Amino acid sequence: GSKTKEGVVHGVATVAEKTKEQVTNVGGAVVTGVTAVAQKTVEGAGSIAAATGFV
Amino acid sequence: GSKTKEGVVHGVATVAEKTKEQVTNVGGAVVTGVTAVAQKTVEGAGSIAAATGFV
Amino acid sequence: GSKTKEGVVHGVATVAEKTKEQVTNVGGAVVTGVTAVAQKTVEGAGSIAAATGFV
Amino acid sequence: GSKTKEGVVHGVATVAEKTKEQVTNVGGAVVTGVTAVAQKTVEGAGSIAAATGFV
Amino acid sequence: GSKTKEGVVHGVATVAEKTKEQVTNVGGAVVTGVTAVAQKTVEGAGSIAAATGFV
Amino acid sequence: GSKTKEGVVHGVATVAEKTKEQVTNVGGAVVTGVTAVAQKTVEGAGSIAAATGFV
């Protein structure tokens, strides 16, 4: 290709004003606050923000 | 290709004013706050924000 | 192709003013707040915001 | 007062995608692109985006 | 006062993607691109983005 | 006062992607690109981005 983008994040502005933020976890899984993330996978399973409790 | 975009996020502005934010989890799975995420997968299963309790 | 977009999010503005936000989970799965997400999968099962309780 | 706002701009998200922008002026006045501006004046004349040709 | 804001700008997100930007001026006045500006004046004339050609 | 803000800019995110930017001036006045500016004046005339051609 000549100009190609695959799995790209660009030109982003983010403001997050939070007075109080609190995360409590007991024996589980928590994913929080994922921002401006990019991935490319070939021949594989790709998961960005994947929470799983048990197996 | 000449100009190609696949799995792309661009030109985004986000403002999040929160006075209080609270996440409580007991033996589960929680995904929260995913923003401006891009992925491309070839020959694989790709999940962005996938929560699962047990297996 | 010459100019092609597949699985693309662009030109987005978002404002979220919340005084209080609260998420409680007990043995389940919760996905909340997914915004400006893009994916492209070839030969695979792709799920953006997929919650599942048990298996 | 207890909680007072006078001349306030808050919680704003703006996206401006322009391929070409061009401003030509010959002996005049031009005001362009004013965004998220706040003022408070006491005992005076206050003008935000005021163009004037001659005097 | 107890909590007071006068002439305040807060919580702003801005994205400006421009491929080409061009400003030509011949003997005049040009104001361009003012963003997130705040002022407070007491006993005076306050102008944010004020262009004037001649006097 | 107890908590007071006058002429304040806070919590700002800005992205400016420009491939080409060009400003030409011949005997005039040009103001461009003012961002996140704050002022407070007592007993005086205060101008943020004020262009004037001649006098």
Swiss-Prot record, chains A, B, C, D, E, F:
Q: Which domain of life is it from?
A: Eukaryota
Reported tissue expression: Highly expressed in presynaptic terminals in the central nervous system. Expressed principally in brain.
Positions modified as Phosphoserine?
A: 47
Q: What's noted about post-translational modification?
A: Phosphorylated, predominantly on serine residues. Phosphorylation by CK1 appears to occur on residues distinct from the residue phosphorylated by other kinases. Hallmark lesions of neurodegenerative synucleinopathies contain alpha-synuclein that is modified by nitration of tyrosine residues and possibly by dityrosine cross-linking to generated stable oligomers.
Q: What is the effect of changing residue 13 to T?
A: In PARK1; no effect on osmotic stress-induced phosphorylation; increases oligomerization
The places in or outside the cell where this protein is found are: Cytoplasm; Membrane; Nucleus; Synapse
Name where the sequence repeats lie: 2-16, 17-27
**Residues where Cu cation binds:** 10
Q: Which cysteines are joined by disulfide bonds?
A: none
Mutating residue 10 to Q has which effect? In PARK1; no effect on protein structure; no effect on phosphorylation of the protein; no effect on membrane- and lipid-binding; increases oligomerization; increases fibril formation; increases secretion of the protein; impairs copper-binding
Task: Explain the purpose of this protein.
Answer: Neuronal protein that plays several roles in synaptic activity such as regulation of synaptic vesicle trafficking and subsequent neurotransmitter release. Participates as a monomer in synaptic vesicle exocytosis by enhancing vesicle priming, fusion and dilation of exocytotic fusion pores. Mechanistically, acts by increasing local Ca(2+) release from microdomains which is essential for the enhancement of ATP-induced exocytosis.
Q: Which pathological condition is tied to this protein?
A: Genetic alterations of SNCA resulting in aberrant polymerization into fibrils, are associated with several neurodegenerative diseases (synucleinopathies). SNCA fibrillar aggregates represent the major non A-beta component of Alzheimer disease amyloid plaque, and a major component of Lewy body inclusions. They are also found within Lewy body (LB)-like intraneuronal inclusions, glial inclusions and axonal spheroids in neurodegeneration with brain iron accumulation type 1. Parkinson disease 1, autosomal dominant: A complex neurodegenerative disorder characterized by bradykinesia, resting tremor, muscular rigidity and postural instability. Additional features are characteristic postural abnormalities, dysautonomia, dystonic cramps, and dementia. The pathology of Parkinson disease involves the loss of dopaminergic neurons in the substantia nigra and the presence of Lewy bodies (intraneuronal accumulations of aggregated proteins), in surviving neurons in various areas of the brain.
Could you give the domain comment from the record? Answer: The 'non A-beta component of Alzheimer disease amyloid plaque' domain (NAC domain) is involved in fibrils formation. The middle hydrophobic region forms the core of the filaments. The C-terminus may regulate aggregation and determine the diameter of the filaments.
Family, similarity comment = Belongs to the synuclein family.
- Assembly and interactions? Soluble monomer. Homotetramer. A dynamic intracellular population of tetramers and monomers coexists normally and the tetramer plays an essential role in maintaining homeostasis. Interacts with UCHL1. Interacts with phospholipase D and histones. Interacts (via N-terminus) with synphilin-1/SNCAIP; this interaction promotes formation of SNCA inclusions in the cytoplasm. Interacts with CALM1. Interacts with STXBP1; this interaction controls SNCA self-replicating aggregation. Interacts with SNARE components VAMP2 and SNAP25; these interactions allows SNARE complex assembly and integrity.
What is this protein identified as? Answer: Alpha-synuclein
Q: Write the lineage as a comma-separated list.
A: Eukaryota, Metazoa, Chordata, Craniata, Vertebrata
The record's gene field reads: SNCA
